[model samples]
Target: DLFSVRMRAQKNGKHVSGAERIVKKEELETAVKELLNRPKEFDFMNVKVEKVKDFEVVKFNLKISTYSFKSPEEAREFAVKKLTQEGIKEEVAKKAVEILSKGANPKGGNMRGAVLMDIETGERLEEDKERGVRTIHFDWKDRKKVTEKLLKEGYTLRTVDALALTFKNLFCGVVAELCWSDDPDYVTGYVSGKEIGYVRITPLKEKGDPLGGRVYFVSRKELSEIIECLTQKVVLIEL
Candidate 1:
């Protein structure tokens, strides 16, 4: 349960300060009743207080203006330090710094954050782009359909317990088609479809125990059309 109040301020040119007024409950009720009795030209106003079970109220104060950092270096340094303290590896932290230094927009970098899960055990591994490593518990069962398809096309298959291995060999320092399971609950893969993989897919959820279903790999080339062909047989999952 929740309670809220809304009040419209005067449209006069002058600014108003302290928009809230704390009054006794009786006074609040009286004001509400008075307002209800009269029709005003201004917008509607309301206020309410309520009790709720198992609820938390968070107070947030936001500032509207934008502020620029002194330098990208400083910002990058801070990010690396903060992430490292949060248990990120030194190498990964350093790489993050390098990525930032290269002026790669954190919001638009080729490498970004991702999540992988083991479909069977339900264990999850978060991938850090800075460190370029992803360790996840994976299952071969979820991989079978795609594997069979790739095998039918004469492509070789390799299995590793960690998603990092796949990324390292498949994503890092080379152009390749990155294929990934599109749906955690189904047997399907989405192909980046280009030798120079441009898309990034990040997992957002994990269900089932043993967490073994998340699997990703690089295909020979961007097979977007080919993936579309398989869409009828299996869904192509996206980030």
Candidate 2:
């Protein structure tokens, strides 16, 4: 197959569904059209097409959009709101947002991943908590088993949109999570927790921008204990 398509659809900022396929160019039109003709109007749709010709690869990116933030502060405010809904204290949410803002531009471009902070002490937990989640044993993308389980639970590649869930599943007392990606073309992020579940937040940066990360506000866990859990624990996402 010389043509491939990867598409994601969202409604009200929450990830609805996504699919990827490889097909011939003649079938490309039909494939894209069928994907677009959904029963509901998605607030945002991101589609990427790759064509391989004579060993050369060309990519075409398309974003069909309705909602996004134009400013970093706006995105940050929205994240705070979502986090609060996930049972995080409003005060703590603001503080976490502030910390995330300092690590990267307001747009969440060129950011690191995973920042763990103590909900009670406000002290960062990870060794490089100032930078982001950096564990030799744990990785957001490496959770294939976890991703598969979430998919069955009606989460569409939730690990990609809701990176914090990986940690949430691994540890206890994870009060809430604030997450966005560093992918410049991706504009969606989320706040998640055991109480409110995964709640999508958008424009954590404008579309086609960069700088994003995941922040977890935790309670009832010690620093070394939490760090060991991240660096040494073997998480099994089996049902």
Candidate 3:
């Protein structure tokens, strides 16, 4: 996260559970003072910029972390505002805030995820929630094995739309029938299951419900990995 890997943190990293405040470019100095009280661990006064060709930051505050601080009230009211300067979608920003506020709950209480269940088959279609993730273990794990036991007996991917009524059901039904042809272009992260490892619900070909399609999915062995060696790639920064 420094000028380069060699320019990384001057010292080895330490885990200090805390909170932080979001401040404007102009307000950063002052915010630093308020939080510093006399300087706490993991507290800093600079920004991290990514300028490599391999990858560039797609969003500012995409994954914001809070340090030990005064209160959650201070953050919601003064920490940061208008955080979308780096193309962070509204949906993702809301998600970031929800995560940053893990220990501290905001004024409105916590958000409750709603499940979109297929009424007829009594199977889950989607949940208005973020997928949980964690580091790897056991060298490697197979999602197919986990997916094996999770097959919702009577419910197939295409049949989910059958539970929709009127417009919702009718529109979803058409899309659900096309999981075979639709290409799963994005990985939305893990939601439920044994959470075996970094493995997700396969190289799923999902028709995004947002785009009005149903995807028959579970775990599949292959997720098209764009694997290549470092020398095979040239990362650069262009103005």
Q: Which candidate should be chosen as best, given lDDT against the real structure?
A: 2
Give the TM-scores of the predictions, in the order they appear: 0.19, 0.53, 0.18
Where model 3 places Cα greater than 4 Å from the true spot, the runs are 1-69, 76-83, 99-131, 137-239
- Per-residue lDDT tens digits for candidate 1, residues 1-239, read 22222233332432121112122354556534543444344344444433222222122111111112354344334434433343345455454334323422234433222322121222223244332233221122223354566467543443221222233323232122223232235222221212322222222112211111222222224333322222111111111
Compose the digit string of candidate 2's lDDT tens values, residues 1-239: 44555677998975555654345687788768766774276889988777633221222121112234677678678767766775567778887776665554234333344777777656666654435554322223223454676577655654433343344333534567776676667667666665555555566766655456667776644555665555444332222
- Model 3 C-alpha lDDT per residue in residues 104-162, reported as the tens digit of each score: 11233222222222222323333322321111111001222222432354333222211
lDDT values, one for every candidate: 0.29, 0.56, 0.23
Comparing 1 with 3 on TM-score, the higher-scoring candidate is 1
Best-matching candidate per TM-score:
2
Worst 10 residues of 1 by lDDT: 230-239
Candidate 2, residue 41: the lDDT equals 68
Order the candidates by lDDT, highest first — what do you get? 2, 1, 3
lDDT of 2 at 94: 85
